Amino acid sequence: MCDQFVGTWKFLSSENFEDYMKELGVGFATRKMAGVAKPNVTISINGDVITIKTESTFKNTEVSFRLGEEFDETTADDRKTKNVITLDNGILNQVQKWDGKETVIKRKVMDGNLVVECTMNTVTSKRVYERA
What we know:
It is classed as lipid binding protein. Keywords: Fatty acid-binding protein, beta-barrel protein, lipid binding protein. The chain has helices at 17-24, 30-36; strands spanning 7-15, 40-46, 49-55, 61-66, 71-74, 80-88, 91-98, 101-110, 113-120, 123-131. The protein is mostly beta strands. It has a single domain (1-132), classed as Calycin beta-barrel core domain (Lipocalin, Beta Barrel), CATH 2.40.128.20. The chain has a ten-stranded antiparallel sheet.
């Protein structure tokens, strides 16, 4: 019926993740630990406030936001970013901006799988997660 964002998702696979993180400017070596982790992402909703909590990784993070409203995030690679997330037809669209640069992270639920497609400049990278 509806499998939607809320709940807990376990890494399954990734594609092109290395060239994306290079495009972002992630340092050689942070790129390494990022490619061995199998992160667990929990999406939780409290009223009109979404929380995306990333665990089982090298550096755990938690971001809480309201749709359409701009917020700050210091990312697990030390970027200091401004973000706006919107929702259109079941896809969360995050626009992440630091230094005249920008990345777009799209999240969509497809049949108990969460597909996160990240795009910067030329480069796109897909990560798939399985519902826990």
